[model samples]
Target: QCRQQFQTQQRLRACQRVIRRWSQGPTLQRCCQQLRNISPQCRCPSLRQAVQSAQQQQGQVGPQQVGHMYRVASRIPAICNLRPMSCPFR
Candidate 1:
């Protein structure tokens, strides 16, 4: 169990690294590719969908909510990271 958890954490860290790299460069295509590469099992339809939702509901969600989504989508294993918490839409 410990080894399994460690592997899971490692995978998430790898995902985070990819996301951080893309953030520094800032390109939609690259970001999507990174997300897919890092977490092939991702539940989110696409990174574009997250960005679009974030933009569409900018006025509704606060900075913390946005940050949380970004963090989860970036680092957490996709199997459990796609759903929005308490938010109306994901």
Candidate 2:
């Protein structure tokens, strides 16, 4: 039970870190490692929130970041070789 909690916490951190640094190469790779255990439903929204939070933290909020996130999300299925998900790009 305790191990499950620890794993859950790790997953939470990894998931958010990826979204926060989605534009980076290393961050994405790390996030992808933990992605195997996360559900698309869970991750999709987490990334979406991260994108919003990222832009909100900036001086300007625009499609630029959102598009960037979409691009990163688009690669998930291919990166993790998982089921296809309709990313926010739609």
RMSD of 1: 10.8
Tens-place lDDT per residue, model 2, 1-90, is: 323432463544554555446654266566566555556556555445445545544455356666775676666646666544545544
Best-fitting candidate, measured by lDDT? 2
> For residues 1-90, what per-residue lDDT tens digits would candidate 1 score against the true structure?
323332333333433434343433234344334444433333233432343344343456556555555664543333333332212233
* Model 2, CA-based lDDT: 0.53
Give the whole-model CA lDDT for all candidates, comma-separated. 0.39, 0.53
Count clashing pairs, candidate 1. 0
* TM-scores for every predicted model: 0.27, 0.49
Model 1 segments more than 4 A misplaced:
1-49, 52-59, 76-90
Q: Which 10-residue window of candidate 1 scores lowest in summed lDDT?
A: 80-89
What is the lDDT, from 0 to 100, of the residue 22 in candidate 2? 64
The C-alpha stretches of model 2 lying farther than 4 A from their native spots are 1-26, 56-59, 85-90
